[PDB]
C-alpha cells in the first residue's frame, strides 16, 4: 500500500516525590502498534502488541529489552540535565519525549528518516531531513547540539535510519503482510437528522478503515462547501481500524444537491454519496 513508515515513540515523566521517571515506549508500523515497554509493568521487557511480531526469537526480544532499558536510563539522566539547563526546581514533574523512525517510498526504498526530541511538550532538538545537521530551539538545546555534534550522533543515527531501520521495516511488512499490506476501504453511509422544520443535518460516515489517513469533503451542486459543516477528528475503533464523519446542515428538501466525497488509499476512485433514499 504505497509508502510505509516505522516509528518509535518514547515518553518519560519525572516523579520528584519518590523514585525514578515513568517510561513508556511504543513502536508502530504505519498505523499499527506492534511493541510496547512500560516501566510500571511487571515484565520489564519489550512486549509484543501485534501477532506478526510474536514469531521473533528470544535474541530479538532480549536485544529490544536491552535497548529500551538503556534508552530509559538516558532519558532519566536527561530529565536531570534539562532541569539544570532551565534552572527549574527539583519539585515539579517534567516530561521528555522522543520520536524516531524511517519512511520507505512506493519504490520500497529509503525515503526519509527522523529523530525529534521535546521537553515539556515543546520542540527541543530535531535532526534535519539531511540527517546531518540539527535544529535546536533555544540555548539549552544548543548546548545539547554541541554535545551531539562532538559525539557524531547524526552519523550514527543516519546509518541506522538509512540501513537497519528500512531493512527491519521491510521485514515486518512482509511478515505481517496479511494485515500490514491490506488496505481496508471505508464502509460509508449517510444519515439524516431533522434539526427544525426547515433544515436537516446530513452526516457522512466512514467506518472500519485502515490506514487512518482519509479526506471527507462536502459539495453543493458540485462545489466544495465548508460553511455549515462539521468534521470530527479521526478516531480509533479499537480493533485496529478508524472512524470519521462529516456533517452539513441543509435546507430541508434540498438534500439531493449535496454530495459527500470520500478519499482513501483503499479506494481506487473516490466515493460519492448522495441522499436520495
Amino acid at each position: 500500500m504505497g509508502s510505509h513508515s516505522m516509528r518509535y515513540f518514547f515518553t518519560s515523566v519525572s516523579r520528584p516525590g519518590r523514585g525514578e521517571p515513568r517510561f513508556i515506549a511504543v513502536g508502530y508500523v504505519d498505523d499499527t502498534q506492534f511493541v510496547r515497554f512500560d516501566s510500571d509493568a511487571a515484565s520489564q521487557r519489550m512486549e509484543p502488541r501485534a501477532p506478526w511480531i510474536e514469531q521473533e526469537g528470544p535474541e530479538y526480544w532480549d536485544g529490544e529489552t536491552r535497548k529500551v532499558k538503556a534508552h530509559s536510563q538516558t532519558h532519566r539522566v536527561d530529565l536531570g540535565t534539562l532541569r539544570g539547563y532551565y534552572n527549574q526546581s527539583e519539585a515539579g514533574s517534567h516530561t521528555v519525549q522522543r520520536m524516531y523512525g524511517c519512511d520507505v517510498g512506493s519504490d520500497w526504498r529509503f525515503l526519509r528518516g527522523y529523530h525529534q526530541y521535546a521537553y515539556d511538550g515543546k520542540d527541543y532538538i530535531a535532526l534535519k531531513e539531511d540527517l546531518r545537521s540539527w535544529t535546536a530551539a533555544d540555548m539549552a538545546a544548543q548546548t545539547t547540539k554541541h554535545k551531539w555534534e562532538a559525539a557524531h550522533v547524526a552519523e550514527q543515527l543516519r546509518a541506522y535510519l538509512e540501513g537497519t531501520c528500512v531493512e527491519w521495516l521491510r521485514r515486518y511488512l512482509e511478515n505481517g503482510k496479511e494485515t500490514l499490506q491490506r488496505t481496508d476501504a471505508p464502509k460509508t453511509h449517510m444519515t439524516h437528522h431533522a434539526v427544525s422544520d426547515h433544515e436537516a443535518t446530513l452526516r457522512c460516515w466512514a467506518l472500519s478503515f485502515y490506514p487512518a489517513e482519509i479526506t471527507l469533503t462536502w459539495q453543493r451542486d458540485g462545489e466544495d462547501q465548508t460553511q455549515d459543516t462539521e468534521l470530527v477528528e479521526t478516531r480509533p475503533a479499537g480493533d485496529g481500524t478508524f472512524q470519521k464523519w462529516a456533517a452539513v446542515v441543509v435546507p430541508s428538501g434540498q438534500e439531493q444537491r449535496y454530495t459527500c466525497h470520500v478519499q482513501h488509499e483503499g479506494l481506487p476512485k473516490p466515493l460519492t454519496l448522495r441522499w436520495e433514499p
Binding site: 536491552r66 538503556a70 539522566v77 534539562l82 527541543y124 545539547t144 537497519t164
Partner: peptide, 10 residues
C-alpha cells in the same frame, strides 16, 4: 528494531 543501545545523553 530500535536504535541502540548507545543512547547519548543531552
Amino acid at each position: 528494531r530500535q536504535f541502540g543501545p548507545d543512547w547519548i545523553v543531552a
